[PDB]
Amino acid sequence: CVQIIGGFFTWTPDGIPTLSNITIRIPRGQLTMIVGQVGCGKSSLLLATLGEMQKVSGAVFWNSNRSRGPVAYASQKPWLLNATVEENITFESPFNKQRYKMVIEACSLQPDIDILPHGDQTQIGERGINLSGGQRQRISVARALYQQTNVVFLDDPFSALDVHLSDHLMQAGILELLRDDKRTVVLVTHKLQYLPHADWIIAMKDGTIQREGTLKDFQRSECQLFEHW
Numbered sequence: 001c002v003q004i005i006g007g008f009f010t011w012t013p014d015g016i017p018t019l020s021n022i023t024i025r026i027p028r029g030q031l032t033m034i035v036g037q038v039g040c041g042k043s044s045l046l047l048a049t050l051g052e053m054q055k056v057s058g059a060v061f062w063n064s065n066r067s068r069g070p071v072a073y074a075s076q077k078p079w080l081l082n083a084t085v086e087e088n089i090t091f092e093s094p095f096n097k098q099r100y101k102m103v104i105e106a107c108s109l110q111p112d113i114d115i116l117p118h119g120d121q122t123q124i125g126e127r128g129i130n131l132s133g134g135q136r137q138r139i140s141v142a143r144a145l146y147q148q149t150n151v152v153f154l155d156d157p158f159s160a161l162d163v164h165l166s167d168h169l170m171q172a173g174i175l176e177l178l179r180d181d182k183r184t185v186v187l188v189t190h191k192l193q194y195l196p197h198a199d200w201i202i203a204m205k206d207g208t209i210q211r212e213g214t215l216k217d218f219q220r221s222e223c224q225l226f227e228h229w
């Protein structure tokens, strides 16, 4: 799907590229884990592949299985439309009882709605009943998974929740959704407990790509020693 050759990303409308020499691809039928340090150009790569940055020096050939499809996404900072929880998650799409139950189970929405006086009918966000960081992160994650897109981007949903139970439940739900729906995904986070197992990692470290390959290259780079310790 994703194809980048020149690899230029610039927030300034002229000069000073924040991400350069990035030559990576994200082929369809995949579940990509993203591994990298803090502030090394991780979310910038996701936005550049989305086409929300100045594409000055590089090529972007997009085609699903250069035309863009409705790619699902959820930024690191979440976003909760001031409406009901059902509308905040379905997001102007047809409502199905089967898939809503599956999503609300994997995303742990029944315990969450219990913390609310209405749940699937309460108001949330600005000018509404307040929320918590974990609840907002999980609500955003559910909306990305329920939208039935050719891809699904999860910008650090595991980092948001310190608890291991929520992280393990979310990881199991992501695996189940990807296996039972056959849709690509990409998790941009720092949770290395699963990335070298059955994911095709790609590292853009210190403002440039290090290696864009499969899990085989993880045994030929001498870098996962800290992830396994």
Ligand SMILES: Nc1ncnc2c1ncn2[C@@H]1O[C@H](COP(=O)(O)OP(=O)(O)OP(=O)(O)O)[C@@H](O)[C@H]1O
Binding pocket: 011, 018, 037, 038, 039, 040, 041, 042, 043, 044, 045, 076
């Ligand atoms: N929206 C933006 N506007 C301006 N500069 C940006 C923006 N996003 C990223 N940058 C710049 O590009 C750099 C790359 O950041 P990067 O993508 O690694 O962030 P991150 O690891 O996702 O962030 P965080 O620490 O919040 O989790 C940033 O340090 C910043 O200098």
